[PDB]
Design a protein around this ligand. Structure first.
Ligand code: ACO
Ligand code: ACO
Lengths: 167, 167
C-alpha cells in the first residue's frame, strides 16, 4: 500500500470514508458535508484540514472499485502555553483492510508532519469503549491528556453568531 | 476602546496577556512560549493562530504603559460532519478593564470572522467553576456541547512522535 497526501481528486473518496466512519459509529446521517464542501475547504487556496489517504494497487481495489481504503484528517491547533499542536480529527481504515499496517504507517506519516512543523505534540479523541484503538495508540507512546477536565465545552451556533455579528 | 487584529508589533503584549491569564488561573509557569515563538507562529507566512486585541487610548494606558488590555486567540478547526468551525482558545481582559464592554465587542468581532469564513459554529472551553463567564457566554447564545463525552483525550508527545517518525 501507499500512504500519500490527498489531492483534490480524492474528495469523493474522503467523503465516502467519512461516511463509513460515521456508519461505524452509527451516526451516518450526521454527515452533511458535501464533496463540493471538501474540495473547497481542503484544496482551495487555504485548507481548513489536511488529509492523508491509504491507496492500494488496483488489483486489490474494494468491491466498489475504490483504491482508497483509509484516511487521516487533521489540522494544526495552538496552545497559548506550549505552542503548535497537530490535531488528529478522523482516522479510519475500512474493515477488510485493517491489521495490515496501514494505520501504523499513517500515524508514522503524521508524526513526521508533526516534527516537520515543529509541533510539540499530537492530540486526539478516542471513544472510551474502544479498547482496541486505545491499546493501538498507547502501544505507540500515547498518554492520557488531563488538560480538559474541570472544563465545559460550549458552542455558539450560526444563528447566534449572525445575531451577535449584526447587533 | 478599539478592537483590532493584532500585528507583529503586539507580540510582546500578547505574551504579557497570555501570562496574566495563566496567573489568573494559577499556572503562569506553564507558559513556555516566547515572544519570538508568537511572532513566528502568528505573523510568519502561515499563522497557526489569529489574535484580536483591545487597545485603549494612551491616556488610559495600564500603569506599566500598555495600551493593549485584552485579547482573543483563535484558529479554525474542522469537523468531518459539519465542516468549518472557529475555535476560541484564549479570551481575557485585564481586571481593571472588565465590565466596560470590551469582551462583548471582541466576541462580536469573532462572530463576524466566523460568518465571513462561513463557519457553522464557534466552540470553546470554560472552567466549570466560572459562573460569571458561563453566564456571559450563555447570555450571548451559547449552549452546552455534548460531542466529547464518552471520549478520552490523548496526546503523543514529541519524544514518541520523533521515535515513530524515525522507526
Ligand atoms: C483521533 C481518532 O479519530 S481515534 C479513532 C480511530 N478510529 C477507529 O477506532 C475506527 C476503527 N478502526 C480503524 O479504522 C483502524 O483499526 C485504525 C485506524 C484504528 C488502525 O489502523 P489499521 O490499519 O487497522 O491498523 P494497523 O494494521 O497498523 O495495526 C496495528 C495493529 O495491528 C497489528 N498488525 C499490524 N500490521 C500487521 C501485519 N502486517 N500482520 C498482522 N498484524 C498486524 C499489530 O499487532 C497492531 O496491534 P496493536 O494495536 O495491538 O499494537
Ligand atoms: C474560550 C475561553 O477561553 S473562555 C475563558 C474566558 N476568560 C475568563 O473567564 C478570564 C477572566 N475574565 C475576563 O477576562 C473577562 O471578564 C471576559 C473576557 C470573560 C469578558 O470580557 P469583559 O470585557 O469583562 O466583559 P464586557 O465588559 O463585555 O462584559 C459583559 C458583561 O458586563 C456588563 N457590562 C458590559 N458593558 C458594560 C458597561 N459599559 N457598563 C456596565 N456594565 C457593563 C454586562 O452586564 C455583561 O454582563 P453579563 O455577562 O451578565 O451579560
Amino acid at each position: 500500500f501507499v500512504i500519500r497526501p490527498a489531492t483534490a481528486a480524492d474528495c469523493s473518496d474522503i467523503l465516502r470514508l467519512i461516511k463509513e466512519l460515521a456508519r461505524y459509529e452509527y451516526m451516518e446521517e450526521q454527515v452533511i458535508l458535501t464533496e463540493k464542501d471538501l474540495l473547497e475547504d481542503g484544496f482551495g487556496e487555504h485548507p481548513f484540514y489536511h488529509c492523508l489517504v491509504a491507496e492500494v494497487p488496483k488489483e486489490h481495489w474494494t468491491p466498489e472499485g475504490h483504491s482508497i481504503v483509509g484516511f487521516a484528517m487533521y489540522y494544526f491547533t495552538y496552545d497559548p502555553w506550549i505552542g503548535k499542536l497537530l490535531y488528529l480529527e478522523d482516522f479510519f481504515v475500512m474493515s477488510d483492510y485493517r491489521g495490515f499496517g496501514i494505520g501504523s504507517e499513517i500515524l508514522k506519516n503524521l508524526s513526521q508532519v508533526a516534527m516537520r512543523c515543529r509541533c510539540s505534540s499530537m492530540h486526539f479523541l478516542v471513544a472510551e469503549w474502544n479498547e482496541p484503538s486505545i491499546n493501538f495508540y498507547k502501544r505507540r507512546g500515547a498518554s492520557d491528556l488531563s488538560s480538559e477536565e474541570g472544563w465545559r465545552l460550549f458552542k455558539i451556533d450560526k444563528e447566534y453568531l449572525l445575531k451577535m455579528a449584526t447587533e
